[PDB]
Write a protein of this length. Structure first.
Lengths: 519, 404
RNA sequence: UAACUAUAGGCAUACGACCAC
DNA sequence: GTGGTCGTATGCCTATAGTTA
């Protein structure tokens, strides 16, 4: 039996919680069950010696019980499992005084029992059960390394590549080893068939599939729809949820009844079409290499499918919330790749060979000029309809014969009024006024006006580090209806070249006096 | 044996490992279990310590690395206040320094009974098929700061015949020996101490601390200056005014009068030439008001320059550097963004121990998920420095590239 | 009603950095 | 001293999906 020593929390005594009001109808049935448990040797009779009581709900005791190390934190993914020929499932002293529980008319003494074995609904009950099971299975695992045994709560999953005659015999040998310690297991006729239902997954020896997922609905029903789509995202490759998530930007209300937008129902209707045709997943093979492919489906959305054989997917998924507002189609792709790289270590235990929709010419240009370091060991180029493309690149050296544009923007948070202007070496100048704006937005407006009026070859000088940092990157997002106009202008131009404030630099001083005239 | 207790008042998640690394760790842990170094424990122990697999050059085989970073912060009163290691200021000045690993020495001395539960670690499994094998240390573990503190009483006794012979510093599992002897003499004298280790029973890497001279930041020597050349210069030097109070840009700004094109050539006057030449002298001469403080923690920040170039700064307070320089590249075969950073961090850490004797806080220009996956591949040292991940400004990147 | 895992939102604190008075 | 804007990290809360007690 080998009992595991269990203690309590440092400065807490046992539960002194009293019993609940009478029922009488349930008490008569409880005596019959407790007498059988006492006869078997699960519980024993006690007297006034024990001061601890439990109403069986061990809610108060578990808060006083010591912390046990995780039984199973991350659940096994069906994609990480191996393909098998035949699979079989099997369905199965000092601390004893704290598990004491009391059961007629006006505060009667009450019947006193205490648990001798592991009580269900406790904290350390599944922890000790698995730890004891691992020690029992150890000799069987060493004697039979060809077979694979997985343990989950009370159920045991056994699978092998052996023939049906040889597999059926080894399960009986496993049963006899468990019955030595006193563990009840179902016989051949009582054993469940290969369609196993585990964690929502319908398991099979060669493939795996999930259970079939089946007017202006309310806000929480949208969250119910998102949860089902997120659950289906592991097997269904083309899943778009972002528009339903934008509707979830609402607050508090339980019955708001949020209406749908045209773009929200558009991706909702096409997701219904994906869920129509039944799909299945493939198990992992240690001999073949893992291959992952990346696709850009839209704004801030990425989808991936991991496969060892073409058209035979192991696991799919999605990536949306990579970084903040500033995205960069190259960086956000790499952030999505890093998510799968870590995911493959957990599931399969090795890094997959990637097939990205980006050229090696663009990959090298971005990561050499960027400050942040990264490494992708194995990746290849595959041409896809929505190819990742870098729009523009700024000049390293100033352009000859080009018109110089000294630009600056100033704003005040009172009344929210700002001015943006530019002064050229030739003599051209323009000053405009804006409403509901900040210093960051006015400086952003200043560059847009500088690219609106100028020619093809332009030299722009700005005093802000914020304005310089955005254009030097490639923001692909709904952020700044302003920046999207700036990017579009920079593509039209051939060559564009892009100082401390309040220092007295010629050119910058003349602009600052114009924009901060009324501010 | 010696009783060990935690700090009054005061469990880390295990990072997933590869299929090859897990099988390698199981082989080592089974060998250590039979020897009597570690033993299996049940689920009643809530304390956990991260474990990683690294590779060696001399041994060529896999080595077990346990990250005691979280535990060392809770046990700081034992190995610094109760049993602190003395540090001399004469180790930083030598001709040749040789580093040797003596981590196998701690596997003999037993650990405190009541303190064994805090050194427990878990080996992760592929797709969580097996519950995970649990172990705890019965002896002094590698990576724990209390191990050299307890062994110190025996370490001083065995180094006494060596110290009396030649009129040395111990940190973690590594031993640092400094000498002013010749190249051929240094290799022989180290072997004399190495042969002495075998008497007790326990078991191109060479450093030059005199060659760590701080390279000064040099300004571009240009024959003909343009507006764009001045504007880039003023912007860099104005930012550097808080580091060096001697730098001024006032006369360089008076060269630009009114709106001008970037290509326009501006001749330097008597005011501009005499200011710029003076600023170069301040960059060559060490800055005043910089001193080491034992009470404050050390900080190290690394910047990426590109084309296989990396620059670093060692400081306790912002804009007040104690040690600066640049690590280019381990030139030749195959080097990446992670490898060049991993080789840099280990080099900066080793330099920090010789001069001061403390591991600095590393500021890295890399993502958390990217670093934690690939750092184990090129890691060799047993000491794990505390690191953080931050943003790199454009101004600090363009300044330290001018450093020679 | 609670716990484990994953995803979608919001709020608050702290640090590094930037801007205005 | 106050507010806004980027990045990192922590916390806990409102919800969902799979599951269990």
């Amino acid at each position: 039996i080998e009992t595991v020593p269990v203690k309590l929390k440092p400065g807490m005594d046992g539960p002194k919680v009293k019993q609940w009001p009478l029922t009488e109808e349930k008490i008569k049935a409880l005596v019959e069950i407790c007498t059988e448990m006492e006869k078997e040797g699960k519980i024993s009779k006690i007297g006034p010696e024990n001061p601890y009581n439990t109403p069986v709900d061990f809610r108060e005791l578990n808060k006083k019980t010591q912390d046990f190390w995780e039984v199973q934190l991350g659940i096994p993914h069906p994609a990480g499992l191996k393909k098998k020929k035949s699979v079989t499932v099997l369905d199965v002293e000092d601390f004893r005084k704290y598990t004491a529980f009391t059961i007629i008319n006006n505060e009667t003494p009450g019947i006193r029992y205490q648990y001798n074995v592991l009580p269900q609904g406790w904290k350390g009950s599944p922890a000790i059960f698995q730890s004891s099971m691992t020690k029992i299975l150890e000799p069987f695992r060493k004697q039979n390394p060809d077979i694979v045994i997985y343990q989950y709560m009370d159920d045991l999953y056994v699978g092998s590549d052996l023939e049906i005659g040889q597999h059926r015999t080894k399960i009986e040998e496993l049963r006899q080893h468990l019955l030595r310690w006193g563990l009840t297991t179902p016989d051949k006729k009582h054993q469940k068939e290969p369609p196993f239902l585990w964690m929502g997954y319908e398991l099979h020896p060669d493939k795996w599939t999930v259970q079939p997922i089946v007017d202006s609905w309310t806000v929480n029903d949208i969250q119910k729809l998102v949860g089902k789509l997120n659950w289906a995202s592991q097997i269904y490759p083309g899943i778009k949820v972002r528009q339903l998530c934008k509707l979830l930007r609402g607050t508090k209300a339980l019955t708001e009844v949020i209406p749908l937008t045209e773009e929200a129902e558009l991706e909702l209707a096409e997701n219904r079409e994906i869920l129509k045709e039944p799909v299945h997943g493939v198990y992992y093979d240690p001999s073949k290499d893992l291959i992952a492919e990346i696709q850009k489906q839209g704004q801030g959305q990425w989808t991936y499918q991991i496969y060892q054989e073409p058209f035979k997917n192991l696991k799919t998924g999605k990536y949306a919330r990579m970084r903040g507002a500033h995205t960069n189609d190259v960086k956000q792709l790499t952030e999505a790749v890093q998510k799968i790289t870590t995911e493959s270590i957990v599931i399969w235990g090795k890094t997959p060979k990637f097939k990205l929709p980006i050229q090696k010419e663009t990959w090298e240009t971005w990561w050499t000029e960027y400050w942040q370091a990264t490494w992708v060991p194995e990746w290849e180029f595959v041409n896809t309809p929505p190819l990742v493309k870098l729009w523009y690149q700024l000049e390293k050296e100033p352009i000859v014969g080009a018109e110089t544009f000294y630009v600056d923007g100033a704003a005040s948070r009172e009344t929210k009024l700002g001015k943006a202007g530019y002064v050229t070496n030739k003599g051209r100048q323009k000053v405009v006024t804006l409403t509901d704006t900040t210093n960051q937005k006015t400086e952003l407006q200043a560059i847009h006006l500088a690219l609106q009026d100028s020619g093809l070859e332009v030299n722009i000088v700005t005093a802000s580090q914020y304005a310089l940092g955005i254009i030097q990157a490639q923001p692909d997002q709904s952020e700044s209806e302003l920046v999207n106009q700036i990017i579009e202008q920079l593509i039209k131009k051939e060559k564009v070249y892009l100082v401390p404030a309040h220092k007295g630099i010629g050119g910058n001083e003349q602009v600052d006096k114009l924009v901060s005239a009324g501010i | 044996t010696v009783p060990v207790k935690l700090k009054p008042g005061m469990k880390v998640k295990q990072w997933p490992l590869t299929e090859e690394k897990i099988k390698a760790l199981v082989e080592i842990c089974t060998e250590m279990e039979k020897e009597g170094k570690i033993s299996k424990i049940g689920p009643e122990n809530p304390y956990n310590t991260p474990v990683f697999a690294i590779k060696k050059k001399d041994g060529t085989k896999w080595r077990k690395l346990v990250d005691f970073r979280e535990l060392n912060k809770k046990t700081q009163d034992f190995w610094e206040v109760q049993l602190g290691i003395p540090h001399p200021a004469g180790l930083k000045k030598k001709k040749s320094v040789t580093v040797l690993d003596v981590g196998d020495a701690y596997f003999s001395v037993p650990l405190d009974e009541d303190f064994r539960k805090y050194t427990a670690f878990t080996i992760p499994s592929i797709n969580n098929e097996t519950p995970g094998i649990r172990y705890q240390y019965n002896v002094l573990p590698q990576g724990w700061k209390g191990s050299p503190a307890i062994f110190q009483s025996s370490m001083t006794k065995i180094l006494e015949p060596f110290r009396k012979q030649n009129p040395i510093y111990q940190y973690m599992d590594d031993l640092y020996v400094g000498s002013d002897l010749e190249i051929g003499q240094h290799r022989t004298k180290i072997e004399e101490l190495r042969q002495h280790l075998l008497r007790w029973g326990l078991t191109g890497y060479e450093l030059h601390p005199d060659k760590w001279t701080v390279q000064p930041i040099v300004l571009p020597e240009k024959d003909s200056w343009t507006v764009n050349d001045i504007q880039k210069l003023v912007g860099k030097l104005n930012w550097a005014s808080q580091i060096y109070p001697g730098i001024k840009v006032r006369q360089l700004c008076k060269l630009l009068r009114g709106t001008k094109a970037l290509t326009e050539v501006i001749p330097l006057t008597e005011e501009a030439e005499l200011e710029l030449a003076e600023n170069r002298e301040i960059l060559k001469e060490p800055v005043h008001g910089v001193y080491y403080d034992p009470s404050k923690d050390l900080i190290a920040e690394i910047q990426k320059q590109g084309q296989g170039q990396w620059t670093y700064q060692i400081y306790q307070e912002p804009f007040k550097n104690l040690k600066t320089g640049k690590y280019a590249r381990m030139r030749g075969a195959h080097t990446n963004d992670v490898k060049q950073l991993t080789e840099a961090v280990q080099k900066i850490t080793t330099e920090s121990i010789v001069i001061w004797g403390k591991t600095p806080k590393f500021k890295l220009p890399i993502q958390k998920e990217t670093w934690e996956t690939w750092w184990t591949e090129y890691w060799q040292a047993t000491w794990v420095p505390e690191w953080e991940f931050v943003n790199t400004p454009p101004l600090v990147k363009l300044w330290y590239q001018l450093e020679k």
